[PDB]
Design a protein around this ligand. Structure first.
Ligand SMILES: [Mg+2]
Lengths: 133, 98, 325
RNA sequence: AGAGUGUAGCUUAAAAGCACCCAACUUACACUUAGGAGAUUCAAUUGACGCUCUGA
RNA sequence: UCGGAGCAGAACCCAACCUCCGAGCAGUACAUGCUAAGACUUCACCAGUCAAAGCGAACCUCAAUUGAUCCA
């Protein structure tokens, strides 16, 4: 009693298999929407938010300074937030990301420290190919 | 020049969507383009147009200067051409019962 | 004719008589913030989303921040350690519910198993899969475990004192969709002792088919006010294990609210085939994950200016021949 | 003596975002990067502490 | 037929069978990669073009120096 079209209902199945399709266009606008999991960071005064949005924009995990939990014990704060988000992604099962900041934000040492902490946690910002056919 | 295919018409991937000199037509979802500044289909499905704010790439410095010349309350907006894929990517079919 | 905008046109009010008196987007982040604020609105000219989409605690936190700044001073900044274990514990204590609800919505667990009605899990529950003796594989919300390591029943921790733990695969394997395959059923658990409650459905191993993508299996514990009866013994029948969590929550879980959930992925492995052959006593199915084929263009009488590939589209393949030997 | 009264400068915020200033690139400005300084006035929905206006 | 300085002193233009230097050039080259869906079609073909996904990289000088179709 096995159906011919067995359809598993894991939401992350196509993204993990990379078969999740992406919007090929929107190349003129910045940033492009051709990603599966994109790390969107919004840096503000004192507190800075960092989410990981899907193709629809589903920011499943956030790690900001306003959470009032890690308030006990800045580029160092950015590295700490990156490490915490990497641990949260490892717990939730995320290893493929898309970090696309501005070139000034790319030159930012806070972003570099956060990305280094994310790589130490085991989160790759590489966005691997979907593999055609 | 102009838009080759109207929005909502089903078109295969690689078909010519909108061709223009000076980019009157902007790229939306699944809309390829080359050096000729023309929009073409990147997937099979239905075409749609959407007025969404365009933010240029950081590589374009003149566009950055123009956006800086725009006011802080000024919003650009631009007509992008999205290609909603009608068909799915693929389906899992039961191969055999070993 | 001439179609203008239906709603308010963009950049209309901010023009004014003195255009040079505008503050202007001097920073590119300011223009980006204004654009994002506009994009948060749904607008009247449609978009891509149209087609696709306490005071005492504050004082204590301020004192803690002041103490941390005094300990740093500055000097520690000029590179703070910030251990993530205490931060994670405090986040699970304070703000774990919103992130848990976001993860449950992202996995589609509430929309599939419970047919909607997502809730923030108050009780923080994490599973420990027994893999040898040391250590135990940690299973959080979304932690992936293979079917080989998931042969035996795992432990669970929630730090709470009746309860009812269950496990369901929302992927709808074998049978029809919009269903979940039950794996374990613990009921009327007294305190933290899950073994105190009865076990209706004995714990079965994961059986994901080959090449069927990833499967989503969730273990859920709900807050139970009073113990209630259940019902199916240790059985390998797939018809008895097929049950939807929404129907169970609707007309049976009246005096019961959710407390905690833990999601996990499941893929085909050697133990899945072993359970299929031995325990299920059936042949293991394999799925193909096949994409749609090309449409192929319209065939005309002559190839016109096209190359030789025009006359060879709509049959198959490689060695066919002429009239007859 | 009366009215209006109350989140740092600002908020159809409930402790955040715009704002403050420092540097380096700047002739200079601006931007960016690194920073930090920053507030729901106190007692039980009520009272007073603080200010503006109307008086004397 | 075409340019540089002044007349034309500080966004354009400005005039003289105006005041002076110039020009019918000269020198130096011919990722300007490969592969690869899907389209345009010289109203046939030939000839030509556009271009998505992949591999492998970045991330002309002059001062003028010239002109037009038509018949060759
Ligand atoms: Mg067109």
């Amino acid at each position: 009693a096995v159906a011919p079209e067995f359809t598993n209902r894991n939401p992350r199945n196509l993204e993990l298999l990379s078969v999740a399709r992406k919007e090929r266009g929107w190349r003129t606008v910045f940033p492009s929407r051709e990603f599966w999991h994109r790390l969107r960071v919004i840096r503000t005064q004192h507190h800075v938010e960092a989410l990981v949005e899907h193709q629809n924009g589903k920011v499943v995990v956030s790690a900001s300074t306003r959470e009032w939990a890690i308030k006990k014990h800045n580029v160092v704060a950015c590295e700490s937030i990156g490490r915490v988000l990497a641990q949260r992604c490892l717990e939730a099962g995320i290893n493929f990301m898309v970090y696309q900041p501005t070139p000034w934000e790319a030159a930012s040492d806070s972003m570099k420290r956060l990305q280094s902490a994310m790589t130490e946690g085991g989160v790759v910002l590489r966005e691997p190919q979907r593999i055609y056919e | 020049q102009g838009i080759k295919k109207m929005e909502g018409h089903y078109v295969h991937a690689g078909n010519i969507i909108a061709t223009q000199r000076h980019f009157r037509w902007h790229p939306g979802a699944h809309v390829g383009v080359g050096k000729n500044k023309c929009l073409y289909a990147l997937e099979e499905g239905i075409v749609r147009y959407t007025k969404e704010v365009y933010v240029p790439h950081p590589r374009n410095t003149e566009a950055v200067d123009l956006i800086t010349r725009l006011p802080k309350g000024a919003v650009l907006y631009k007509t992008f051409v999205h290609v909603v894929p009608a068909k799915p990517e693929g389906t899992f079919k039961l191969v055999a019962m070993l | 004719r001439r179609t203008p905008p239906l709603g308010p046109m963009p950049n209309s009010d901010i023009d004014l008589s003195n255009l040079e008196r505008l503050e202007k987007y001097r920073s590119f982040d300011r223009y980006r913030r204004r654009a994002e604020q506009e994009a948060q609105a749904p607008h009247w000219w449609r978009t891509y989303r149209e087609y696709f989409g306490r005071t005492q605690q504050l004082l204590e936190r301020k004192q803690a921040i002041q103490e941390l700044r005094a300990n740093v001073e500055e000097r520690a900044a000029r590179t703070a350690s910030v251990p993530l274990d205490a931060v994670r514990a405090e986040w699970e204590r304070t703000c774990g519910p919103y992130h848990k609800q976001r993860l449950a919505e992202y996995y589609g667990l509430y929309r599939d198993l419970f047919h909607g009605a997502t809730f923030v899990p108050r009780v923080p529950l994490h599973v420990a899969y027994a893999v040898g003796e040391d250590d135990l594989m940690p299973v959080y919300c979304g932690n992936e475990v293979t079917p080989t390591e998931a042969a035996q029943a795992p432990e669970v921790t929630y730090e709470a004192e009746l309860w009812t733990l269950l496990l369901t695969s929302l992927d709808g394997h074998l049978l029809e969709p919009d269903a979940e395959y039950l794996h374990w059923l613990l009921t009327n658990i007294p305190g933290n002792r899950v073994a105190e409650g009865q076990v209706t459905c004995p714990y079965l191993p994961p059986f994901p088919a080959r090449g069927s993508g990833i499967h989503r299996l969730a273990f859920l514990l709900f807050k139970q006010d009073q113990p209630i009866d259940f019902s199916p013994s240790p059985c390998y029948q797939l018809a008895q294990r097929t049950f939807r969590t929404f129907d169970f929550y609707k007309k049976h879980q009246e005096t019961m609210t959710p407390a905690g959930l833990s999601f996990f992925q499941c893929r085909w492995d050697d133990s899945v085939t072993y359970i299929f052959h031995q325990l299920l006593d059936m042949r293991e199915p394999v799925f193909e994950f096949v994409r749609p084929p090309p449409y192929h263009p319209k065939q005309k009488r002559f190839p016109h200016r096209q190359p030789l590939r025009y006359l060879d589209r709509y049959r198959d393949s490689h060695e066919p021949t002429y009239g007859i030997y």
